[PDB]
Design a protein around this ligand. Structure first.
Ligand SMILES: Nc1nc2c(ncn2[C@@H]2O[C@H](COP(=O)(O)OP(=O)(O)OP(=O)(O)O)[C@@H](O)[C@H]2O)c(=O)[nH]1
Ligand SMILES: [Mg+2]
Lengths: 139, 141, 168, 109, 199
């Protein structure tokens, strides 16, 4: 594991993941300017991570509370650990918020992104297919 | 697997039914505000019309008809979007041109309160017609 | 701190103690009944010096001459080698010289080569004089120590000597 | 190389995008295969022809260029097929308009 | 392993779906009530734009018409002719003589009394509404007063004050404070009417 990326507030891998943190779609490109796109199933959202600039990796999809991410990579010898310092992410291993479900999404409510993919008929644009037999398209 | 599907179907169908009547009511009650149409329209494959618009509507129903975004905002209780943005601020409007990576507003794409948007208005009225035909087809099947 | 990785290859005549040397270094273990290696075994271990974690990726080659033709595959891109002989076996030392020669001719020019005079715990059956081996090592810029995988003598020391010489 | 691919199949060539870190994404469209979960998704290279299916083994296909034009495409299926059983997997034929599908009965076509 | 966000959907959707219960949302802002965003009541310092005021009056007519037809209260002394921002009220007590609820009508017509008659009529109709709900002894008391003849709206408790329904010239404490308190009474009224309509 030359790299290890964690949504955790702590730099080591504290097992703070709800089940959906481990269950997600992902899309990567061996070409085309080296973009990567990543579902965070804990937060039900599309992060971006650019092989060109991990520090400047502006996510493509929003958050209702506080979206901005100080994505700074630290090191503890053995892995170049990426501290995704999302400003006020509001997630942990238990239900310390009254509801926190389908109402908490960048416009287009849904189940977790089963599949996400990019297509380019004119401009580049992207599809998110949810577990719910439902799809939303972004441009 | 069985019980989960049963629960899900049950909650879904029940909760649809409970406010389906209220949604029916939201078009079936003009008692609050006159000249409703209850799931009937003349714009089907017809991109322009005057059957009521600048004819039977006499300024008032012309401004009242633009309030349709409130019915969309009423739909909004069970939170979800629609194919043209469903915000209501009373009785005036203008239509956006496009949005993928714009930096400034496009509401000049067709003015709605004044007739003076007319050339552009031959186009952007098709957007609300598309909003209508999607919802109508979704009512029909 | 920083981590530096290096490919290291062990070469030498069968039964000289290559797998024993590396087991001692890697595991702190030694088996009188160590099995002769078939092909090549991969092992890894670290040393620390000058705040640098030096991680060896070790290819422990089968010494048997049938596997000679496979050796260049394992030492291609190797930054370090240990050529091992048995101090009780003068011919194992003749074979060791021929491995050192092959390395000079066919390996990366930067290779740091260590020479192990192994089984030095059996010094009362010595066949290879220390100063002869040292003279050969000095003449060829090899790091030479007599080692014993059995007792652990100079095992850690030879790998540390390599780590020190390697570009870090 | 193409002994089956030129007997009854059609042909097309692949279309990668420009670097895509630059764009923000704004939600442009919304739609559905059926209420049942998507068995699998596939997008053709040709016209980005969009292929999808219900868990039930009922196909649901669309034309992206038709959507770019008519804009109606979210309301209704462009293409369907009767599989007669639950789709286990989907994969496009590489360099082809043909589509390969497998079912929980072991049957493939 | 699937039904977790499904349980999210069903619970959230049903809970949210239940929220429909009223027509026009009103929010307090500065020193005026805003009805579905439109400001109602020009400040002493700043005459808020007449089209916004007139639009607010249009929507206020639409709201009253609805509330009435929901409770079953009928305005005997009035016929309502909405005409958008230029709506009008034919007070039968005034034989529909000066119906316009819209305000501006020439420089000297700052002194004009069309809307004052309509507001006197409207405040009399609010008294009518108050009695028509009082008959039911519903979720309510009578915290509100209004000197309808002179044009006034009045609140009872700590303030005790009544401000006039006519600006006379400038909207000031008169008119703006009257609109705010009348709108508070209408907010109460909309809550009580929504209860009675739902029941
Ligand atoms: N006395 C003594 N015996 C040793 C020493 N090192 C290894 N041996 C023994 O010598 C025999 C052969 O050792 P290995 O480590 O298997 O030799 P190798 O060089 O790996 O042999 P191949 O895999 O056939 O090339 C075994 O019995 C070992 O236990 C040592 O330092 N002293
Ligand atoms: Mg061996």
């Amino acid at each position: 594991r030359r790299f290890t990326l964690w949504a955790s507030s702590a730099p080591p891998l504290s097992e703070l993941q709800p089940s959906p943190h481990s269950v997600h779609g992902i899309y990567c490109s061996p070409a085309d300017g080296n973009p990567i796109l990543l579902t965070a199933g804990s937060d039900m959202k599309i992060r971006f991570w650019d092989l060109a600039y991990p520090e400047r990796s502006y996510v493509v999809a929003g958050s209702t509370s506080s979206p901005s991410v100080s994505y700074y990579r630290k090191i503890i010898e053995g892995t170049e650990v990426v501290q995704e310092i999302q400003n006020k992410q509001k997630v942990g291993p238990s239900d310390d918020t009254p509801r926190r479900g389908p109402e908490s999404l960048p416009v287009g409510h849904h189940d977790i992104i089963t599949d996400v993919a990019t297509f380019q008929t004119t401009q580049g644009f992207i599809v998110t297919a949810s577990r719910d037999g439902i799809v939303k398209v972004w441009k | 697997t069985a019980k989960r599907e049963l629960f899900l179907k049950t909650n879904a169908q029940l909760t649809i039914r409970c406010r389906q009547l209220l949604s029916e009511l939201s078009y079936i009650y003009p008692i609050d505000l006159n000249e409703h149409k209850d799931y009937f329209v003349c714009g089907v494959k017809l991109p322009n019309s005057e059957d009521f618009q600048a004819k039977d509507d006499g300024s008032i129903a012309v401004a009242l008809g633009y309030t349709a975004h409130l019915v969309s905002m009423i739909s909004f209780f069970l939170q979800v979007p629609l194919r043209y943005p469903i915000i209501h601020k009373g009785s005036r409007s203008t239509i956006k041109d496009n949005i993928n990576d714009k930096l400034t507003e496009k509401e000049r794409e067709f003015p709605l309160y004044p007739k003076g948007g007319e050339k552009l208005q031959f186009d952007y009225g098709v957007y609300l017609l598309n909003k209508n035909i999607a919802q109508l087809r979704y009512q029909h099947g | 701190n920083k981590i530096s990785q290096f490919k290291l290859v062990l070469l030498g005549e069968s039964a000289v103690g290559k797998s024993s040397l590396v087991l001692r270094f890697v595991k702190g273990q030694f088996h009188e009944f160590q099995e002769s290696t078939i092909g090549a075994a991969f092992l890894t271990q670290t040393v620390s010096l000058d705040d640098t974690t030096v991680k060896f990726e070790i290819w422990d080659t089968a010494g048997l001459e049938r596997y000679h033709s496979l050796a260049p595959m394992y030492y291609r891109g190797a930054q370090a080698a240990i050529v091992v002989y048995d101090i009780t076996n003068e011919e194992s030392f003749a074979r060791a010289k021929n491995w050192v020669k092959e390395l000079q001719r066919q390996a990366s020019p930067n290779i740091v080569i260590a020479l192990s005079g192994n089984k030095a715990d059996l010094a009362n059956k010595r066949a290879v004089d220390f100063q002869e081996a040292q003279s050969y090592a000095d003449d060829n810029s090899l790091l030479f120590m007599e080692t014993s995988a059995k007792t652990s003598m100079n095992v850690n020391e030879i790998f540390m000597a390599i780590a020190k010489k390697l570009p870090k | 190389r193409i002994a089956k691919q030129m007997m009854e199949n059609a042909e097309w060539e692949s279309k990668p995008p420009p670097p895509g870190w630059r764009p923000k994404g704004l939600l442009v469209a919304h739609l559905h295969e059926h209420k049942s979960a998507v068995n699998r998704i596939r997008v053709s290279d040709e016209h980005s022809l969009f292929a999808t299916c219900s868990n039930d083994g009922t196909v649901k296909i669309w034309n992206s260029q038709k959507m770019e034009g008519k804009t109606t495409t979210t309301r209704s299926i462009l293409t369907y097929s009767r599989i007669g059983g639950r789709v286990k997997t989907l994969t496009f034929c590489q360099g082809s308009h043909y589509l390969a599908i497998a079912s929980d009965n072991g049957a493939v076509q | 392993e699937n039904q977790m966000r499904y349980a999210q959907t069903q619970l959230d959707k049903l809970k949210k779906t239940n929220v429909f219960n009223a027509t026009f949302h009103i929010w307090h802002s500065g020193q005026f009530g805003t009805i579905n965003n439109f400001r109602l009541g020009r400040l002493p310092s700043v005459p808020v734009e007449w089209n916004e005021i007139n639009a607010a009056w249009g929507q206020t007519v639409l709201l009253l018409h609805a509330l009435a037809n929901k409770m079953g209260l009928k305005f005997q002394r009035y016929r309502l002719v909405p005409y958008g921002n230029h709506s009008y009220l034919e007070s039968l007590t005034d034989k529909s003589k000066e119906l316009p609820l819209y305000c501006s009508g020439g420089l000297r017509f700052f002194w004009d009394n069309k809307f004052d008659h309509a507001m006197v009529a409207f405040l009399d109709c609010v008294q009518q509404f108050k009695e028509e709900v009082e008959k039911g002894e519903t979720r309510f008391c009578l915290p509100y007063r209004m000197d309808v003849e002179k044009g006034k709206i009045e609140d009872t408790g700590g303030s005790g004050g009544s401000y006039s329904i006519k600006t006379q010239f400038n909207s000031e404490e008169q008119w703006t404070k009257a609109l705010k308190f009348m709108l508070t009474n209408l907010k109460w009224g909309l809550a009580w009417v929504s209860s009675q309509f739902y029941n």
